[PDB]
Amino acid sequence: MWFEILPGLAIMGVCLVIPGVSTAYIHKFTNGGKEKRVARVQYQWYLMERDRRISGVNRYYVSKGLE
Amino acid sequence: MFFINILTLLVPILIAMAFLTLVERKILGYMQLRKGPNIVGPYGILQPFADAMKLFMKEPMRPTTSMSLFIIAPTLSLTLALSLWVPLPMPHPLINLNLGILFILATSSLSVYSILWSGWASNSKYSLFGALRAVAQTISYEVTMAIILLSVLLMNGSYSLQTLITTQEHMWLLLPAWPMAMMWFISTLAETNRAPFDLTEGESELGFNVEYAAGPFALFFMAEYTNIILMNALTTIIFLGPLYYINLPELYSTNFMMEALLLSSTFLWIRASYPRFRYDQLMHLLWKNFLPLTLALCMWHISLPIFTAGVPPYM
Amino acid sequence: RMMRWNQERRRLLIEDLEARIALMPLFQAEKDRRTLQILRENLEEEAIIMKDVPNWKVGESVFHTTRWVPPLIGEMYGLRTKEEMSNANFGFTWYT
């Protein structure tokens, strides 16, 4: 019966969600719980870099009004 | 970390790539009143690994040849196909590229060589012709394939595949632009040399695998199937936009999983259902039936934005 | 729907471009302030190394005009941290 084709599809599927969940949590871990900034245009890289200089060395650390 | 994120996004796809052949040799089976492979392993789950080990152990005959193409070519086919998964924006992409779709279009285009190189490398005048069929059709279908994307982009505003997740937050791009989806789907069927458009490996010997056995056979082989997925996945981002919620990124990937599998299932279903087109029948479709439709609908997609005051926001 | 969605998006495109428009003046004051510092800091080191140099003023515009001239990223960091240099040159392309 067709249901036997499912085992194979399942294994494919599980192996196609891993990548999307993986890439989207190894980003939120490396960037400090905040989505990796996407610097499409320089302004953004500038702002990002500015952030680095503002604190520690990493941009993800984010200083606030209390600074 | 980034390395781990390279294992994921690769292995997972390779393991899934293996399970597609299985779900191809069973879905084609049940459609043809037969169980398909269930005896090796449970329900045939170990079947893809089994043939892989046989293929690598058999003598790479290396058949008499230009050697460095008998080795370089297979590698290019796997390298480009696995590489094109680098930017796919399943939820977040891995390497977000501002000109992402041009990367995908360019990387696909390079695979036509592997066919050309493999065909010249065998020393069978037959093969030299077989490669010609694929190389010619690939570039041909590429011309409508590219124009169909340019129509899309102009309604997306950018070349970055990440933008479409924000373009398709209210409706799939199938509703609009369905006429091209169909034409993207048929072109995706040609570029993966799948059935309706599989003249290669056709009556030649039912072309560029003729002399390829064991490990070289496998690498292209792997490449084709990974592509089979990738192109289907590009259909599932560009035209069928999976629901995106910024709070939970995986329902995007969960639906990306569901739509990709169904459209991957569709080309499996297409293969069993249709006879293969003639070589000229195939080019007659693209240059006569599709290219005039695509070029005109291309203009409609430069006009729809302007007079409907809908010019898309860059960025 | 596409017409309405992109019109909404375009309005948003306007709402955030203006947000930087407002934030730019501060950045301009900051950039310049920091830029000059890099030039000057390089002057200190410049003098330190050019003093021994025979009859070589510490620094002189290769261009005789007295107009203010932006420094090349190469001038600003060439003698600074090589890593800093690299970041400026190929940093954005490699992004993050």
Add this chain to the structure above:
Amino acid sequence: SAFLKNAWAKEPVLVVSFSVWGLAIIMPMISPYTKYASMINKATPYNYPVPVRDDGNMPDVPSHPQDPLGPSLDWLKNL
């Protein structure tokens, strides 16, 4: 006309093909929104708007962004 008919039924792609070619060559000419595209895109502010000195001889220019003077995009709003 008659061929047109058969053409609609035989070789029914070109017909559609040309039809679109034209409809895209017409809608822009006749539409209540075509004008907006050059405006909506014109308005989008990408490069800083540099302020002019106040000779004090200009009433048109608004002295402050929020002033009741100057350009407005309420056309963009409620579009």
Add this chain to the structure above:
Amino acid sequence: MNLYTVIFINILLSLTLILVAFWLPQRLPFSMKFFLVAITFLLFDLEIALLLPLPWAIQTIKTSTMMIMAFILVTILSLGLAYEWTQKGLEW
């Protein structure tokens, strides 16, 4: 760099396979049609290029000229196709 890292792993994975694959185991076909296609292909491929900047050009303030230009390009090439059809070309 991030891309470089990914790509070299990509080549490495493929070279690894072929290497194991080779190590674990231990004259005149010519039709102008084919050449003609290749040519047409580039004439179309070049056009694809002149059409690729259209996403950035959409945002151009002119708009009228943009479309007037783009429509002329698509129409003149399509006529090229038209003559290709009319002539034996594209008829293999």
Add this chain to the structure above:
Amino acid sequence: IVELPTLEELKVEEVKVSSAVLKAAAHHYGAQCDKTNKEFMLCRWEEKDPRRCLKEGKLVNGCALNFFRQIKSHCAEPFTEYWTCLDYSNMQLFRHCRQQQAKFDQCVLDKLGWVRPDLGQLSKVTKVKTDRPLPENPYHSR
């Protein structure tokens, strides 16, 4: 020589806050502090030499600093919630956070009275008159 200004001459306080924070309040900073901002900018453009317009620049940071101190005094909690949600997004897009935005914007219209500038009305060119003489011979043309 180069007459590059000295460090002590260019050592002034700055906001030094995460890009997001500036962004979150940007719309109101473009509002409460453009009088001086513009001036610095007009100085900057017409007198191509930054070195010449440095002073105006110190005024810029300062005006903003208090802008922040006032925010710190009132509706600070709101602002804190708005920036944190704004920062999480990768492009720090404004529309993901509108509920948090409404609070702070509403509050500053209760406590500080300041107003969020309507779509536009910040892009429009401004007229600011400055004592600094319209630099003649900018470009130091010969």
